[PDB]
Design a protein around this ligand. Structure first.
Ligand SMILES: *[B@@]1([O])OC2=C(C([O])=O)[C]=[C][C]=C2[C][C]1[N]C(=O)[C][C]1[C][C][C]([N][C][C][N])[C][C]1
Ligand SMILES: *[B@@]1([O])OC2=C(C([O])=O)[C]=[C][C]=C2[C][C]1[N]C(=O)[C][C]1[C][C][C]([N][C][C][N])[C][C]1
Ligand SMILES: [Cl-]
Ligand SMILES: [Cl-]
Ligand SMILES: [Cl-]
Ligand SMILES: [Cl-]
Ligand SMILES: [Cl-]
Ligand SMILES: [Cl-]
Ligand SMILES: [Cl-]
Ligand SMILES: [Cl-]
Ligand SMILES: [Cl-]
Ligand SMILES: [Cl-]
Ligand SMILES: [Cl-]
Ligand SMILES: [Cl-]
Lengths: 246, 245
């Protein structure tokens, strides 16, 4: 969403770490968002592994993914990361961002069905050019932090163009922290270290349920070195702690 | 299914002088291990562990309208301060808000309640003693083995309820989330009991890890609230020593 306001007091967490990024935090009850940088909140970036959220819903809706108990078998051939070399459930693949698992899902979904669902979802620029199994990693697909929070709100309310059962399945898989006072659903993303003078992007998106309130958030930053990855969680976490949400 | 005794876990009980049982089953309930065969099948007051089937029944009957329903507090005194506030379904389950589920049970009614406990094969299915308290001081009894069987059905979406409603309840039961494993669980506590008849404390749930699942159920005699943390520390130590964590 209903409104958005700039809160430049959040810039302290960024400049303390020398990070160029944006944080968007929306309070569901009031339909109001706050961000440290309006301009970057609307800038569109490669979603990277955050795309595993819509990709998982689409895989379920199309039947490519049978259910949350399907085991994605490893065929024993080398993968890019050791943590991907094992059988995985849907949650396990999401948790380790198992690219080849979701590349296979995308191929089976196909270009036509993928295009349909991103229009239904209003997901970014909806441009899936560049290869059916790479458009979210190195293609032309772009999405903003504001779009991410809007998309995640629809998922939370089960308002996406998909069965409630399938949206619930994917929500169960995104739980990342459970405390007595609150519950966190989130997904990380990382496009890489980018080229010279053209850094990559790192994401952290999700929502926080605390008491009877719901907070949707989206963070992204420029990243040129793999070691800066933890900042995509520490900076949002510190902001949300300063807001009393933890 | 068969129940197998595991004598090595008794060390955790004896160090604390606790009379209780731990049941742990990998993959399924077909083969469960325990420290005490007799107590593993002994039926006890379920206490607040009954909020699991009660929540499923509330959703199946429409008493609970949807996953996002807020249980408003009318402002009048409740036994515990953590209950004196508006609560979601997860919130009510996490603080064990008795008043919320008492009203749910009253709206469900005895006939529908009996129907669903028969479908769930939930313990002795005896709901006598008051619709808003048969699980707290009534005749309902359930064993650790029965709890594991019931939790396995819920895990598989095999209970007599929509998969949607079972998913809603499972989401409300998440208590620990780590990159390596996910824990769903619920605590229970009937009180300190009468003279020579102690209360019961519960911890039941399951652990999802790699491509494997582990179902567990713990109960213990309790006559002093100071012993309550043992209901999680004993099973936690056992599951830690087994590498489940
Ligand atoms: B995805 O963006 O998510 C992801 C993360 C994450 O959640 O931030 C961490 C590690 C891998 C992945 C897979 C997806 N990202 C990529 O595929 C880009 C790729 C991943 C591996 C990196 N290897 C560094 C060199 N040793 C290079 C970029
Ligand atoms: B329920 O069993 O869950 C519950 C727990 C728990 O998670 O085990 C802890 C505290 C309260 C509750 C509510 C439900 N149990 C009861 O209503 C019986 C009540 C429990 C507290 C006892 N007094 C302890 C002193 N602080 C007396 C009986
Ligand atoms: Cl909003
Ligand atoms: Cl842009
Ligand atoms: Cl980009
Ligand atoms: Cl790979
Ligand atoms: Cl909560
Ligand atoms: Cl990495
Ligand atoms: Cl990280
Ligand atoms: Cl085991
Ligand atoms: Cl009893
Ligand atoms: Cl009360
Ligand atoms: Cl207490
Ligand atoms: Cl405890």
């Amino acid at each position: 969403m209903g409104s958005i306001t700039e809160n430049t007091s959040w810039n302290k967490e960024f400049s303390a770490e020398a990070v160029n990024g944006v944080f968007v935090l929306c309070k569901s009850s009031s339909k109001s968002c706050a961000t440290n940088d309006l301009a970057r909140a609307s800038k569109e970036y490669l979603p990277a592994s955050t795309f595993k959220i819509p990709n998982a819903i689409i895989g379920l809706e199309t039947g490519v993914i049978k259910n949350e108990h399907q085991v994605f078998k490893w065929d024993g051939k080398p993968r890019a990361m050791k943590q991907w070399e094992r059988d995985l459930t849907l949650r396990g693949a999401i948790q380790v961002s198992a690219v080849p698992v979701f590349q296979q899902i995308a191929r089976e979904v196909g270009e036509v069905r993928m295009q349909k669902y991103l229009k239904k979802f209003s997901y970014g620029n909806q441009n899936i050019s560049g290869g059916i199994d790479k458009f979210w990693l190195e293609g032309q697909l772009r999405i903003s932090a504001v779009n991410q929070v809007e998309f995640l709100e629809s998922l939370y309310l089960n308002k996406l163009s998909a069965s409630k059962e399938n949206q619930l399945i994917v929500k169960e898989a995104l739980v990342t922290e459970a405390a007595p006072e609150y519950l966190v659903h989130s997904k990380t993303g990382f496009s890489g270290v980018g080229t010279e003078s053209n850094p990559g992007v790192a994401w952290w998106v999700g929502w926080v349920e605390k008491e009877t309130e719901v907070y949707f958030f989206a963070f992204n930053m420029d990243i040129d070195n793999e070691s800066k990855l933890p900042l995509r969680k520490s900076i949002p976490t510190k902001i949300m702690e300063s807001e009393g949400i933890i």
